[PDB]
Amino acid sequence: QPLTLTAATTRAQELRKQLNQYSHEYYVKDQPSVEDYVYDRLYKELVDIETEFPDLITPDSPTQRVGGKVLSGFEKAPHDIPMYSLNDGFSKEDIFAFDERVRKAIGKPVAYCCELKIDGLAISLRYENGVFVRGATRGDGTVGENITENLRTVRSVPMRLTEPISVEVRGECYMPKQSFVALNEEREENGQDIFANPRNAAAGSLRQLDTKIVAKRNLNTFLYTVADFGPMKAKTQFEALEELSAIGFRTNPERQLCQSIDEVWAYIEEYHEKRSTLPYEIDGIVIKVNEFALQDELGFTVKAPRWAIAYKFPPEEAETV
Numbered sequence: 001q002p003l004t005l006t007a008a009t010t011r012a013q014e015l016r017k018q019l020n021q022y023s024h025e026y027y028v029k030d031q032p033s034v035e036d037y038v039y040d041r042l043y044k045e046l047v048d049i050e051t052e053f054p055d056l057i058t059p060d061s062p063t064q065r066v067g068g069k070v071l072s073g074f075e076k077a078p079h080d081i082p083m084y085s086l087n088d089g090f091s092k093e094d095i096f097a098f099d100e101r102v103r104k105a106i107g108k109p110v111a112y113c114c115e116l117k118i119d120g121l122a123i124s125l126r127y128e129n130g131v132f133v134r135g136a137t138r139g140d141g142t143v144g145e146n147i148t149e150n151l152r153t154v155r156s157v158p159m160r161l162t163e164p165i166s167v168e169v170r171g172e173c174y175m176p177k178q179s180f181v182a183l184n185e186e187r188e189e190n191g192q193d194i195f196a197n198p199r200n201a202a203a204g205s206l207r208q209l210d211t212k213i214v215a216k217r218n219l220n221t222f223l224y225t226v227a228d229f230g231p232m233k234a235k236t237q238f239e240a241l242e243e244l245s246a247i248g249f250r251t252n253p254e255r256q257l258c259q260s261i262d263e264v265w266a267y268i269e270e271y272h273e274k275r276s277t278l279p280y281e282i283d284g285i286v287i288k289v290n291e292f293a294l295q296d297e298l299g300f301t302v303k304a305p306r307w308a309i310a311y312k313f314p315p316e317e318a319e320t321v
């Protein structure tokens with residue numbers, strides 16, 4: 001073990017503080033001081049040390065936490081069903097290793113429902129008898145910020161479902177490139193810190209206390225998770241996407257159900273190219289175990305599901321100069 005117990009402990013402490021500090025600025029202030037990959041590199045090191053010396057994992061470690069503390073100002077939005085993060089992949093190997101773990105837990109190969117990781121803000125919508133009653137941010141996974149109002153200024157968010165059914169679903173809220181571009185040119189004239197990336201613009205907007213502003217910003221959505229099914233009958237993630245659409249939610253069409261891990265990778269390769277042709281920023285791919293009975297079997301860890309993995313994409317910005 002290249003690292004000695006002392007070297008890893010001290011390193012894990014440095015890493016824990018440094019990373020925690022950065023999370024606070026990124027979630028609790030939507031004003032990060034470091035690039036996302038700088039954070040990711042450091043985060044990845046912590047994970048390696050924690051994996052090499054599990055005895056060093058502490059409750060305060062960022063590996064044990066999701067998102068961040070709620071931005072006071074708004075009303076607290078407890079989550080009846082917890083929200084999480086996802087485990088990341090940065091190589092074809094990671095994708096294959098993930099498949100390898102799954103196969104070992106299921107005992108056979110499984111088909112994956114692949115989707116584009118829409119780069120925006122995480123949201124949760126609550127419906128009671130077809131009526132939109134609450135919209136929330138992910139927060140720290142157990143308590144978000146109530147942003148129902150703000151969310152009602154968004155066209156795609158349906159006010160009443162197609163059936164007077166009660167359900168809870170999650171998805172993403174974003175700002176198309178088209179508008180990110182525009183908005184900024186405007187803010188510049190108003191001498192305001194033009195938004196860094198489409199992600200922070202959306203987050204900066206939705207977490208704005210004055211809906212008056214929010215309304216004019218122009219955001220869209222994509223729903224991809226059913227938290228509380230109510231009377232929904234889908235047994236697979238691929239079906240749930242159809243059902244979510246069918247009851248009135250906007251859902252992303254690029255999804256593809258893959259029967260082999262080779263197909264998953266090709267899907268990843270594919271959209272990594274088409275990327276530019278899309279009107280919305282995507283920060284990767286989300287590979288999901290299609291069968292729900294199986295997702296239940298795999299379960300979650302303190303921070304993320306075992307039945308999914310997110311292949312990360314550097315922002316096209318960094319692939320285009």
Ligand SMILES: NC(=O)c1ccc[n+]([C@@H]2O[C@H](COP(=O)([O-])OP(=O)(O)OC[C@H]3O[C@@H](n4cnc5c(N)ncnc54)[C@H](O)[C@@H]3O)[C@@H](O)[C@H]2O)c1
Nearest residue numbers: 022023026032034035036039085086115116117118122286
């Ligand atoms: N620069 C910094 O200081 C700093 C600090 C903290 C975190 N970060 C960044 O935050 C991110 C990690 O936080 P994260 O919890 O979002 O981890 P993650 O990037 O692995 O995220 C998954 C999230 O993506 C979303 N998503 C989009 N499309 C989806 C789909 N089809 N299916 C399922 N989910 C979908 C969900 O909202 C979900 O919470 C990284 O990009 C990291 O670099 C940066």
